[PDB]
Design a protein around this ligand. Structure first.
Ligand code: FES
Ligand SMILES: [K+]
Ligand SMILES: [Mg+2]
Ligand SMILES: [Mg+2]
Ligand SMILES: [Mg+2]
Ligand SMILES: [Mg+2]
Ligand SMILES: [Zn+2]
Lengths: 38, 162, 177, 69, 133, 71, 42, 99
RNA sequence: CACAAACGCGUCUCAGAGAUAAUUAAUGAUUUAAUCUUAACCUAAUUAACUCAUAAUAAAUCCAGCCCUAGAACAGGGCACA
């Protein structure tokens, strides 16, 4: 993951999802796109 | 209402849909010229999470909520109804709208803690270890801001954060 | 009342036992009325110097209903004194260990902070469930009303009520629930 | 009022309805009361003794007339 | 006329003893290693009184065991009177043992060092050597 | 109203030890130490234990022997 | 089945005697609500 | 110095004590203190809090009537607001002016 | 190690259950797809604290004197056969 402030989609396959009270950027093709709102 | 039946009869699978008779809307609404069902019956700003008889007509048999397209509710009211259903389930009401799982009911757990007006979910809130003094106080939310427009007979504003 | 001097004073300053149910009642609203009875703020003969005070018996304290998400957010903290002895316990954890700790602490913080607080806390009787010794039961006088009206679940509504409430909308016949 | 009835005024009862009589007993002076004002590190002290005249009354009888509309 | 004896069950606890520490001896095993053993002697051991489960802890019953015999002339009136009813000489030290309901022993039953079989692991509780201030 | 519970200590108040010897008014007493005595009284009157201890000569002497009485 | 007096007390026996005390005061016309003694000039 | 300051506070403390007694005796009849006072003044009954406390303790029957009077007056005030406002003043709400 | 003891460099012993954070997975609705869910029910893999099972303590009211591996004083354990 990568703890960041603002979430942006690096590729078109990234999908937003709200889990545990925070928004997570989960990506299937590229695991390096995983981002976590602080 | 329509239901799907799947039958296995000797390596042959048959899938068919059957139509079940559906209850209809009541004949005379007080406000026939309304658009959305909530404001058609003068229920605008007059329901809360306690009103099970209202929230039980916009939910699926397994606890889910029907889409806004089918019901016809306005966007402003649909979010309020959605919030109330979430609060109703956490409050312990609506016991017959849970999915049936015979294997999971036997291993009982810690007794359920009674709660109501829970804005968030039980598994997504962290303890407030450092509350703070009065000039910077971390207030525990109660209820939802979407229900701050409800009629107040007392006249005092509802205390959402306490 | 034409009573004699001795029995007249005894009747005026009598002690009265109250019963207060706690089935799905917030501890704060349970403590607000319990605090008044312990101090004697309901007697028109009230005075701090006088020892006026009434016993309060609270039953079903395991079924209290904290409003909102306070079961996981509110924390009760204490220090044992020794270094590294600062313990913070969540509201859910404390109620799981000591059933009557939540109600007792709420009342213990609402009474006046003088030295009479220790004296008037001894008159408070707490029980996790409806298991009260016969001695305490024979002392009761009246039961205080519940401060919060308990809402009823869907299965508790009678069929007459279900038919009485109008059907707001007419779902289409072809939709699958 | 009495045991079985009570009369309210708006805001006073008429003189023809209830008569109250009192008798003066003692016309004395109160005990010496002390009034002192003090301010820190400014050398300001004011001590004065007040003797307030007092009067003691004895209420003898209270009568209610039977005239009531 | 002893109390009835029940068969062993899982999770059951037995009754300990009160013994006297004699000294130490060296002991050797068949692999050549050397071990030091402490000689504990049971002089006079008798169960004194039995406490019901709900009056001691609420989970396990309590069995009382006395120590070695001491003189009557240096004990309290209540202590001497208590032993007179049982019919035993006064004991030095008295300890409380937590025993399950299936291993209760009638008070006054003597106990011997054969209560422990070799190969078992046991605990020891006693006041250590006091070195003062 | 409920009937008067007249014979509640019916046998406790008047108990005959035997029909051959006169009844004995032997009030057995233990005279517990100051420790166990206070905790027995505090539990009896539903109070604390700090007020049952006596006080020093200074506080005892300064109490007014003849307090004013009204009525 | 008509109430004429009522009295408190520490115990039932003491309270019952006080109930008779109140009954006698009402019967003898010597209650605490009685008309105050007249002292006006005859 | 403490004697004079406490003398000033003596009047405040006794006033606070009376309000607690009035509230205690008013809650016994199911009426809060704020409703018991304003709805009694509207009846032109000028009784200070000192004598109301005494009536609460030594006059249980009379204090009930005053509490009954306040509740009746309060229920009349809500009736006028609920109506069009053109309702004639209530039988207990009529104002009598001495002149 | 010139006391009958103290001492290390010598010898002995050292533990079960619950519970979690990030994170991972199942079922599934708002959005009849999908989707670990500040959506519900049930359920799974999972840091350390922490809590507890459990173990220790346990007899009200002989006590002058002497002894003691008990001890500053005060207390405590012995003084029937020794
Ligand atoms: S359109 Fe009126 S409330 Fe929905
Ligand atoms: K989603
Ligand atoms: Mg030593
Ligand atoms: Mg799906
Ligand atoms: Mg423990
Ligand atoms: Mg000794
Ligand atoms: Zn991506």
């Amino acid at each position: 993951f990568k703890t960041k402030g603002v979430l942006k989609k690096r590729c078109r396959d990234c999908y937003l999802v709200k889990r545990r009270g925070r928004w997570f950027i989960y990506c299937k093709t590229n695991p390096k796109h995983k981002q976590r709102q602080m | 209402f329509r239901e799907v039946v799947e039958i296995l009869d000797g390596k042959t699978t048959i899938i068919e849909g059957r139509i079940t008779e559906t209850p209809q809307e009541s004949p005379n609404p007080p406000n026939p010229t309304g658009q959305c069902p909530i404001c058609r019956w003068n229920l605008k700003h007059k329901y809360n999470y306690e009103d099970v008889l209202l929230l039980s007509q916009f939910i699926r048999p397994h606890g889910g909520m029907l889409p806004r397209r089918i019901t016809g509710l306005c966007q402003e009211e649909h979010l309020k109804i959605e919030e109330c259903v979430k609060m109703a389930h956490r409050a312990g009401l609506l016991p017959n709208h849970r999915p049936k799982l015979p294997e999971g009911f036997v291993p009982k757990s810690k007794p359920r803690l009674n709660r109501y007006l829970t804005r968030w979910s039980p598994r997504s809130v962290k303890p407030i270890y450092n509350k703070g003094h009065r000039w910077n106080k971390v207030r525990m939310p109660v209820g939802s801001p979407l229900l701050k427009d409800n009629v107040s007979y007392s006249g005092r504003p509802l205390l959402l954060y306490h | 009342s034409s009573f004699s001097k001795a029995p007249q004073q005894w009747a005026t300053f009598a002690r009265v036992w109250y019963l207060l149910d706690g089935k799905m009642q917030p501890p704060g609203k349970l403590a607000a009325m319990a605090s008044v009875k312990l101090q004697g703020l309901h007697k028109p003969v009230y005075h701090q110097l006088s020892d006026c005070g009434d016993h309060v018996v609270i039953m079903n304290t395991r079924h209290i209903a904290f409003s909102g998400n306070k079961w996981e957010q509110k924390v009760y903290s204490s220090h044992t004194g020794y270094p590294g002895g600062f313990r913070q316990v969540t509201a859910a954890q404390l109620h799981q260990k000591d059933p009557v700790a939540i109600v007792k602490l709420a009342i213990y913080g609402m009474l006046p902070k003088n030295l009479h607080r220790r004296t008037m806390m001894q008159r408070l009787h707490l029980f996790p469930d409806e298991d009260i010794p016969e001695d305490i039961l024979k002392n009761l006088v009246e039961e205080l009303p519940q401060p919060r009206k308990v809402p009823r679940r869907l299965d508790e509504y009678t069929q007459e009520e279900i038919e009485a409430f109008p059907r707001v909308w007419s779902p289409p016949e072809d939709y699958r629930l | 009022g009495a045991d079985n009835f009570t009369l309210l005024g708006k805001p006073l009862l008429g003189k023809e309805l209830v008569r109250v009589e009192a008798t003066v007993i003692e016309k004395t002076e109160s005990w010496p009361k002390i009034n002192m004002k003090f301010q820190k590190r400014k050398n300001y002290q004011r001590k004065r003794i007040t003797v307030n005249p007092q009067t003691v009354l004895r209420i003898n009888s209270i009568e209610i007339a039977p005239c009531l509309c | 006329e002893p109390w009835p004896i029940h068969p062993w069950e899982p999770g059951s606890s037995r009754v300990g003893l009160i013994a006297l520490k004699l000294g130490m001896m060296p002991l050797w095993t068949k692999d050549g290693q050397k071990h030091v053993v402490t000689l504990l002697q049971v002089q006079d051991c008798h169960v004194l009184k039995y406490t019901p489960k709900e009056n001691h802890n609420g989970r396990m019953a309590a069995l009382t065991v006395g120590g070695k015999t001491v003189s009557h002339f240096h004990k309290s009136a209540s202590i001497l009177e208590f032993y007179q009813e049982l019919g035993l000489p006064p004991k030095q030290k008295v300890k409380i043992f937590n025993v399950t309901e299936n291993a209760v022993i009638k008070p006054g039953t003597p106990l011997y060092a054969a209560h422990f079989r070799p190969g078992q692991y046991v605990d020891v509780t006693a006041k250590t050597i006091g070195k003062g201030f | 109203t409920k009937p008067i519970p007249r014979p509640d200590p019916v046998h406790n108040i008047e108990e005959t030890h035997d029909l051959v010897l006169k009844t004995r008014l032997e009030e057995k007493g233990e005279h517990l130490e100051q420790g166990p005595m206070i905790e027995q009284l505090s539990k009896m009157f539903f109070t604390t234990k700090h007020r049952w201890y006596p006080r020093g000569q200074y506080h005892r002497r300064r109490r007014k022997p003849n307090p004013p009485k009204d009525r | 089945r008509k109430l004429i007096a009522e009295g408190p007390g520490e115990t039932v026996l003491v309270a019952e005697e006080e109930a008779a005390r109140v009954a006698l005061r009402k019967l003898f016309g010597f209650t605490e609500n009685r008309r105050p003694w007249d002292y006006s000039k005859p | 110095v403490k004697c004079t300051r406490a003398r000033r506070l003596k009047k405040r403390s006794l006033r606070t004590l009376w309000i607690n007694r009035i509230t205690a005796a008013s809650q016994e009849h199911g009426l809060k203190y704020p409703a018991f006072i304003i709805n009694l003044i509207k009846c032109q009954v000028e009784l200070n809090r000192k004598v109301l406390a005494d009536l609460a303790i030594y006059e249980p029957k009379t204090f009930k009537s005053l509490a009954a009077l306040a509740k009746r007056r309060r229920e009349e005030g809500f009736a006028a607001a609920l109506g069009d406002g053109k309702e004639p003043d209530g039988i207990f709400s009529r104002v009598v002016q001495h002149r």
